[PDB]
């Protein structure tokens, strides 16, 4: 797409120095990135609608004054469905209700009471997927939410939702991997949910997260864990819950220790929860394999491979 809106936005704020690296990286990505033509076309064929009623606080919902025609709704439906799989959500957009694989609204509600007041903050969502959580952040009072995700489809999905939200400029998605960033040190709060178990180097992931935070900034870390003490860390084989390159699944206490090791303070384990099939499952918007498929049919306490079932922790830390 044209990131000139975003470059122009940070040129006049505390992220201006990101222009020293960002535009060159996007320029490289725009070259390298067949299915994208089909996904990006789906976004362009979508209508430009300005929400008459918008709710970013209790969900991500958009309404028109008078309902849309059954034909324009069908257009949105079949266009949005071209961007499957839809994993993080849900979105309610002019009656089109995108029920995503994840009930990310649950995880948001559970995480929120533990967060520092988002009001006025500038935030980085690492591996943001669809960008669902960023819209919630705007609703909770965040000034600016930036997500990064190198998956091409998530960019189209977020821009799709953006243009259905009236080209809202308060959230953005940049097709970068967290590796590619310098030490920006400019975000009040960094979220890293669903990313750590995918990193070859877990400590360097945590340092790289710290490098994006202002002093006394907040880190919200969410990832897969197992049960155990400080010394308990699983590294799975070829597949874990059918995922191909999973590296480190520590216990939450292990993770707590890791955050301390990397220079974080006031580290709180804010929640540990088994992932259930009510939170993650197949929908009309995500139809391929999901959690129930990943579990041992005769023991939901285990994956299909033998490992303990998906369990997710939420840690919160402060950068001194």
Numbering used by the authors: 2 to 34, 37 to 323
Task: List sentences quoted exactly from the publication behind this structure.
Recently, we demonstrated that cmo5U modification requires the previously unknown metabolite carboxy-S-adenosine-L-methionine (Cx-SAM), which is generated by the CmoA-catalyzed conversion of prephenate and SAM to yield Cx-SAM and phenylpyruvate. Cx-SAM is subsequently utilized in the CmoB-catalyzed carboxymethylation of ho5U-containing tRNAs to yield the mature cmo5U-modified tRNAs, with no involvement of a mo5U intermediate. As predicted from sequence considerations, CmoB is composed of a Rossmann fold, coupled to a substrate-specific N-terminal domain of ∼100 residues that is unique to CmoB. Our biochemical, genetic and structural data demonstrate that the primary in vivo function of CmoB is as a carboxymethyl transferase in the biosynthesis of cmo5U-modified tRNAs.
Cx-SAM bound CmoB structures were determined in two crystal forms, resulting in 10 independent copies of the complex (two tetramers in one crystal form, and one dimer in the other), while the apo structure contains a single dimer in the asymmetric unit. The overall fold of CmoB is essentially identical in all apo- and Cx-SAM bound structures. Of particular note are six sulfate ions, present in each independent molecule, located on the surface with positive electrostatic potential surrounding the catalytic site. One of the sulfates modeled in the apo-structure occupies a site analogous to that of the carboxyl group of theS-carboxymethyl moiety in the Cx-SAM bound structures. Tyr-200 and Arg-315 also interact with this same sulfate ion in the apo-structure. The side chain of Lys-91 exhibits conformational plasticity, interacting with the active site sulfate anion and a main chain carbonyl in the apo-structure.
